[PDB]
């Protein structure tokens, strides 16, 4: 199956053109590191024919894209370990369904569907908004991870030349939800940063529709106690709500009703402001993108190449559009990749 996939179906020419950033072969592909999972690292290819032939001969389950080096990775055995220095690589983001499992009830374990894909889609929307309006990036594409995740590949030349410090700073700017535990209040800094306020504003309309109706994770009283209650700030309010405890909507309104009943006097304004802040924090915890921090920090990190086959499900890691769903991924898009690669090439020529 993998032999036939790499022989006839895998788009080698298009991946080569995307990675080389030039129609003619250059050092962007000759010096680019390739790792093959069967774990053999430091492979490189001089042409589309060499790429296709080596992939067909080795027959790996998947292979991963590395950074651009000063010298070919295939000749590393003839070079000192300090001689191979990383120059450029596309800025990459990794998002998975694992960190949202405490907030979904349609699927259990490693299963995914279009209902729980809304978390991933909102993550893409927020990340794209950040990269476009804030970082000004234009040539970025989102690729299905194969089972339940999405990979972002920012091919902007400025993004490609970023150092590890710049990549870490970018990730810290984007990765607002640093602590993924659901048993503790986020207590995000106030006032909100414009990026954070904008992200909350975009995530607010979908919050009710997903969480309180479609997922309904807090309908279970124990689940509510474990996740929804710790998002609050007042111990008396938490105890009163626990004693009183309904679908997620009823509990959400009970929070406001009990807070109004408990907090009275001149100090009620501070309490309602704090409750609203906690509710926004919980909305962000439920809906904000939860990136994989490791893959983005360093230029030398290796990420799974596009159009790879997932070993467990057979889904091909296709690029993701606005209407993509996990079910739409075919089992063992090219034109969309053609459009993206062509736009990247014209932008590269414009930058030149």
């Amino acid at each position: 199956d993998m032999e036939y996939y790499y022989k006839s179906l895998y788009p080698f020419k298009h991946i080569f053109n995307w990675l080389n950033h030039s129609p003619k072969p250059s050092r962007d592909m000759i010096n680019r590191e390739f790792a093959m999972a069967f774990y053999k690292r430091y492979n490189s290819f001089n042409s589309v024919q060499d790429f296709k032939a080596q992939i067909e001969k080795a027959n790996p389950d998947r292979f991963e894209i590395g950074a651009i080096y000063n010298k070919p990775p295939r000749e590393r055995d003839t070079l000192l370990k300090s001689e191979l220095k990383a120059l450029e690589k596309e800025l990459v983001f990794d998002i998975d369904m694992d960190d949202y499992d405490a907030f979904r009830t349609c699927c259990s374990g490693a299963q995914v569907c279009s209902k729980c894909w809304k978390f991933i889609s909102l993550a893409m929307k927020i990340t794209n908004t950040a990269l476009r309006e804030d970082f000004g990036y234009k040539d970025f594409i989102w690729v299905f991870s194969g089972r339940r995740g999405a990979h972002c590949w920012v091919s902007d030349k400025r993004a490609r030349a970023l150092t590890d410090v710049q990549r870490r700073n970018v990730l810290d700017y984007v990765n607002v939800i640093r602590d993924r535990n659901t048993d503790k209040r986020l207590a995000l800094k106030r006032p909100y940063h414009p990026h954070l306020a904008r992200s909350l504003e975009q995530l607010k309309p979908f919050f009710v529709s997903i969480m309180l109706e479609e997922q309904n994770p807090w309908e279970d009283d124990q689940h509510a106690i474990q996740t929804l209650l710790p998002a609050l700030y007042d111990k008396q309010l938490i105890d009163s709500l626990k004693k009183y405890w309904r679908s997620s909507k009823e509990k959400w309104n009970d929070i406001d009703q009990i807070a109004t009943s408990l907090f009275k006097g001149p100090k009620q304004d501070s309490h309602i402001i704090k409750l609203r802040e906690c509710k926004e924090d919980l909305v962000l915890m439920t809906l904000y993108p939860k990136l994989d921090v490791e893959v983005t920090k360093q230029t030398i990190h290796l990420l799974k190449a596009p159009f790879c086959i997932h070993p467990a499900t057979g889904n091909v890691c296709v690029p993701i559009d606005e209407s993509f769903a996990p079910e739409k991924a075919p089992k063992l898009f090219i034109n969309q990749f053609q459009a993206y690669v062509s736009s990247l090439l014209k932008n590269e020529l414009g930058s030149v």
Partner: protein, 430 residues
């Protein structure tokens, strides 16, 4: 070059009260002024380094160094001589500290911190003038992004400028100008999110960017000066001075807590005597004053808190500022040769002259009568056998042994320092 040309070039060089030190100075100065100015700037820089190594706050640092500005290298003066002092001192230290990478790092760190201070006492109008002298955004572009910029900088204004009221923050934001720069040069602010970031550009927290640029330019100029130094190795006059200057480099306790029982319970007998005499007489004599001040310095009382405590214990401010403020600051080593005086140990205390009437310093185990000491022990609930033991220790001249005994009964055994007594007593509660 003539005097008029020199004055014009200088007025062009210091159109702002601060300078980036770009063009080397032009003129002739004597070896006297060379050495003196280099020593002055090195003294200020060594003081900044000593403050850094103690992790002092920024505010405390400018409080210590403002008089050193008024004394050694006065700033914010229209005198050309002082400005030339600053310029030539900076370039002389540039010459001196460029030999090794460690020296370059230390020099650029201290100089950038000095730049931070100097920009701090400069006024907002003067800060704007210096910054104008890195592209500032137009008024329309600020108005378009006013909401987002205000949201970004509100917390920074509140926490740095102490503008707690929202109206003051809004008024400051209205007059505040911004600079359009890319995030690659402002990554350190981007990570902390102190700058609004749009379309790959960061809208400036300007002091951090200015200081980073100062550090980079200063390091580059230091490297270039190290390259050019072998040509200047031919002169006999400067080389010994450069070598000499290079080798020259090489609160829980507050004014009210020391009065409380919690802290006073850890005092030794002598410090209790000093404290009580202070309370009764609202004044202490020289040896007692120095003893108590040095003990308080040893236990961690700050210079400002020491000044407040000493002023409030002496229940006019004119005579205080005239006669005791300098002594109480000099005990901390802030003037003169700046001696961070070590607190007196029991040998130093016992080497002082014996106290008389009205004198409270010394050691109670030596200067008090056995009756008064015994009564003070009964006040500490000490039994008669213990009292006899400490009196036997005192009668032999082993006052430190008696104090150690008192510590053990009231609470590496031997204690020969009141500060050691206090530290061990605090440890027993920790």
């Amino acid at each position: 070059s003539s005097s008029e040309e020199e004055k014009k070039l200088y007025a062009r060089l210091y159109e702002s009260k601060l300078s980036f030190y770009d063009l080397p100075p032009q003129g002739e100065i004597t070896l006297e002024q060379f050495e003196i100015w280099a020593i002055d700037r090195l003294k200020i820089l060594l003081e900044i380094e000593s403050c850094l190594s103690r992790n002092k706050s920024i505010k405390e640092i400018e409080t210590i160094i403002k008089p050193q500005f008024q004394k050694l290298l006065p700033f914010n003066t229209e005198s050309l001589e002082d400005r030339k002092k600053d310029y030539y001192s900076h370039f002389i230290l540039r010459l001196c500290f460029c030999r090794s990478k460690e020296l370059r790092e230390k020099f650029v760190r201290a100089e950038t911190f000095l730049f931070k201070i100097r920009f701090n006492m400069l006024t907002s109008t003067d800060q704007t003038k210096f910054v104008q002298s890195l592209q500032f955004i137009s008024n329309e572009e600020k108005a378009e992004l006013s909401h987002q910029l205000y949201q970004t900088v509100s917390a920074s204004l509140q926490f740095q400028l102490n503008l707690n009221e929202e109206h003051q923050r809004k008024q400051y934001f209205q007059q505040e100008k911004f600079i359009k720069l890319p995030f690659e040069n402002v990554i350190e602010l981007v990570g902390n999110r102190l700058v609004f970031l749009k379309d790959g550009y960061a809208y400036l927290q300007q002091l951090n960017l200015l200081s980073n640029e100062f550090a980079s330019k200063l390091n580059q100029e230091l490297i270039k000066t190290y390259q050019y130094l072998p040509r200047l190795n031919e002169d006999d006059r400067l080389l010994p001075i450069l070598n000499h200057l290079s080798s020259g480099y090489t609160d829980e306790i507050n004014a009210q807590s020391v009065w409380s029982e919690e802290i006073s319970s850890n005092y030794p007998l002598c410090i209790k005597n000093l404290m009580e005499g202070l309370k009764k007489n609202h004044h202490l004599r020289y040896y007692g004053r120095q003893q108590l001040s040095l003990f308080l310095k040893g236990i961690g009382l700050s210079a400002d808190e020491a000044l407040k405590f000493w002023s409030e214990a002496f229940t006019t401010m004119e005579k205080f500022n005239k006669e005791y403020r300098y002594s109480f600051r000099h005990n901390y080593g802030l003037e003169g040769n700046r001696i961070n005086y070590k607190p007196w140990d029991c040998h130093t205390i016992l080497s002082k002259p014996r106290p008389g009437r009205g004198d409270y310093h010394g050691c109670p185990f030596r200067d008090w009568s056995h009756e008064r000491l015994s009564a003070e022990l009964r006040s500490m609930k000490l039994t008669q056998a213990q009292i006899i033991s400490v009196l036997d220790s005192c009668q032999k001249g082993e006052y430190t042994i008696a104090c150690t005994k008192v510590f053990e009964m009231t609470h590496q055994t031997h204690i020969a320092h009141p500060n050691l007594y206090f530290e061990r007593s605090r440890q027993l509660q920790k």
